[PDB]
Amino acid sequence: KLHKEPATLIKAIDGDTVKLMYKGQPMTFRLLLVDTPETKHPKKGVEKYGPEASAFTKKMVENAKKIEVEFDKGQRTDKYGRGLAYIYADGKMVNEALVRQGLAKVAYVYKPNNTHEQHLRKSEAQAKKEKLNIWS
Ligand X SMILES: Cc1cn([C@H]2C[C@H](OP(=O)(O)O)[C@@H](COP(=O)(O)O)O2)c(=O)[nH]c1=O
Q: Is 116 in the site for ligand X (CB under 6 A)?
A: no
Evaluate whether 30 touches 78 at the Cβ level (below 8 Å). yes
Q: How far apart are CA 1 and CA 34, in angstroms?
A: 22
**What is the size of the binding site for ligand X (CB under 6 A)?**
10
Q: How far apart are CA 20 and CA 81, in angstroms?
A: 13
Q: What count of other Cβ atoms lies within 10 Å of the Cβ of residue 1?
A: 4
Q: Which residues, numbered 35-64, are part of the site for ligand X (CB under 6 A)? A: 35
Nearest approach, Cβ of 90 to ligand X (angstroms)?
23
Give me the catalytic one of 52, 68, 82, 100: 82
Q: Which residues pair with 96 in a beta bridge?
A: none
Which residue's Cβ has the minimum distance to ligand X? 78
Residues 6 or more apart in contact with residue 49 via CB below 8 angstroms: 36, 37, 102, 103, 133, 134
108 binds ligand X (CB under 6 A): yes
* Residues lying near ligand X in the complex (CB under 6 A): 17, 30, 32, 35, 78-79, 84, 108, 110, 113
Where on the chain is the footprint of Co ion (CB under 5 A)? 35
Q: Which residues are annotated as a binding site for Ca(2+)?
A: 16, 35-36
Which of the residues are catalytic? 30, 38, 82
